[model samples]
Target chain A: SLGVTQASAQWGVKASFQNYIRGSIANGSWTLNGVGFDNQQFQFSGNSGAVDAENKTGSINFPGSIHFTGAGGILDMQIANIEISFNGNSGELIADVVSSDMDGNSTNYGRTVVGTLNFSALNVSATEASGSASVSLSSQAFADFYTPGTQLDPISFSATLG
Target chain B: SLGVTQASAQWGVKASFQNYIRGSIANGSWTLNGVGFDNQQFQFSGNSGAVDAENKTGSINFPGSIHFTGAGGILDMQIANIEISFNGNSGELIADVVSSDMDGNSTNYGRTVVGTLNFSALNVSATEASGSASVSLSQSGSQAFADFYTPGTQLDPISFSATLG
Candidate 1:
């Protein structure tokens, strides 16, 4: 059916960005909806997706949203509705990125391209696959605090095909 | 061998006590080691225990500790190394409780009798049994609270069990 019945992922976007937000000056906090943070990573669970193991192509959708505010209210950002599409050894990290101008005004970059990832390896089976991914931030404004091509923490993901 | 390889429990010690601890007056917080709180209950994982399925007897030990501080540091209590010993429809809640003086002088009551509980029902099988328990705080469990809780206070219900490998 190419349907993914269960899937999960763990990722830490970037260490430096996280630390800066929690510093004395920024004093930032984040809110999570259907998301969990543990062991220094953001955890995600996805129940909907289509995949082609033979060709290693398709998209999996994870449900959750994380909103971060830092710079003492100078910045507000949201990352939600994550989708990972895979092709061979490469994929795009797509998500809904919203950035606010600190005046309660915000921009929702629907399905924006946040970064690109290289698949280090995949453990594939008849109906399951686990893999690790290395992501590099793109220049599409995942917020100005991040440099383009910045290395994010590796993503560990698993999926069950039904 | 009557050994329980894996088991778990979910319990909320008491609703009002938890609320009061987090309230403005108490302003308390808790630290859990090897324990999980989800859906308003504390979760426990017990890997070592002895369970006699036939006679509904034996003890299961859960490894974890929840230390709480409240009353603006006037109170510091610890509950650790919990052991649930069961009989037919009856059991004891045993754990280590440490309540020290303000100067760090404390006595360790190892495996103190914390409370008494009644097993309401058990859907028992050869290798597994799951059921509910209603606990009543005895004078012992209240000692650490400094009589904040009177004996016979009904705590939140618990879901507990034992399993065989």
Candidate 2:
């Protein structure tokens, strides 16, 4: 959970750990450099890491959700405003998932994105056996800045046994 | 088609046509420098002019398909082989589609490509579609011999409509 943390309550209500599984919120223009698998799935049994709250501003409602950013963190990644729904239909997320850095001031974190949900996928209660969401990159969206491999700004997630 | 007519039977099926498609048979390349169309779909229909069946010696295959080879005909230019399947799966074409030089030297059109079965969502009829055939363009897979336009090799497809020509 190096880069992962809790989102602020300032975000709107629909915003939650689930939204991370959907798509994203900020910059959607950067090309995907790589992808892989994350093996930490069981930690959500209510005993995983936490995404504490802070200044809390953006759009998600509840205002508090766990963060699963990569080692580089989500400080300057483009967060596209996408719309991913539950069961491919019902509950949906519509927010700027990440930050925007257009001036080539972003850093790269060699991790894979799990999905765009409000909170960590593992955070979902066991009562909900199945959930739905989507993940996508922005085509024309700009960013706040840019950084290369050393900076580490990408966020990633994957299915794990834990 | 203004190239070699009486090719060695060893070179397979060879033909010689003029004015229809100007090719550099000796240079092993083809160029359609000035032709431009507006939203017009083009294809490499088999060259038709005259065949010197007597000099037919090389392999019985055309090295590559038809391509719009000009600055305006670069990326937007369409190249379809008359020898591929319907869905247009990648690497599903035969070696019949090739590039040749003016001197009749044959080389594999070394490129993996899926013929566009449909342009702009317009599907081609089976009679017009080549099934399960492979097309080659050398290992580079780029029409570097010709001058194209724009960066990233992106050419506007609109420049090749008959309406513009």
Candidate 3:
């Protein structure tokens, strides 16, 4: 006669698998650490004046509502400064290039008005690696920010995530 | 003197440690979660004309910047809708409250911007707990919200973090 034997490693469910999975999923819902951001530049023509630069942070007032497509959102933003450099050709009109100021005081020459405004945050795709977003600007906001001396609506931009 | 001898745990120079004095010092720079947060909330007064409940996720306007006095700066917030129930007597008069008529026109009644506003699950605290926040409003956000309904002047109140959660 012939005989055979099998060997195996011992293992158990360790209390219950439910608790492990539940706690893992719960902790999974925590906010991320890094964030995605956008950089909006503003430029205009036909103007002459000095746009002073100052650090500021505010929401964008847009013409229409902007929808975010992904998970990344605006954490924090800064408006570093507005530097005004002028160049006039002999035949060009002496248009003033005024820049966007958080404090709504026209130090230079540009357009200003009173109307409803919406905010837009430029978000790119959101994954473990990348994300996307866009700056939503209402018609009023676009006009206000897209004035002369506005080569860059936003001097620089950055953000953080959960 | 070959008798008995003994040894202990510490010395001035060649120190020998044993036990663990497990504890932490209060270094005023701690936050709820170093990880981060996703959303926030803000409220506006209902006006005669329809108001913009800037509910877009990750917006930078309306419920403007939230200032603070800690390492973590202002948290992003959204202004959903201004819920109105009226407290017998309307406190302030809003300028731009209108019914949902599709057009941005001005109206007289129907929508008066004066009420309370709170975020359902706004990450108000520094941490991502259920609702453990360590911040306080300088003035009641309720009052500041009501002020926007007044006839003149625009009020942008800055709520900030006072303590850590």
- Candidates 1 and 2 compared: the better one by lDDT is 1
| Clashing residue pairs for model 1 | none
Clashes of 1: 0
Clash count, candidate 2: 119
Per-model chain B TM-scores are 0.76, 0.22, 0.15
CAPRI band for model 3: incorrect
Residue B101 lDDT in candidate 3? 16
lDDT of 2 by residue, B58-119 (tens): 11122233432212121122232323222323322222234323223334544433222222
- Candidate 1 has an lDDT of 0.58
- TM-score to native of every candidate shown: 0.42, 0.24, 0.15
Q: Which stretches of candidate 1 lie over 4 Å from their true place?
A: A1-162, B1-22, B100-107
- Each candidate's lDDT (Cα)? 0.58, 0.22, 0.19
Query: What docking grade applies to model 1?
Result: incorrect
Q: What is the C-alpha lDDT profile of model 1 across A1-162, one tens digit per residue?
A: 011121111111123222222331234557889877666567787677666767767566778887876434534678887777668788877889898763478887788975676788755445765566765544223332221132244665677766
Fraction of the native A-B contacts that model 2 recovers: 0.00
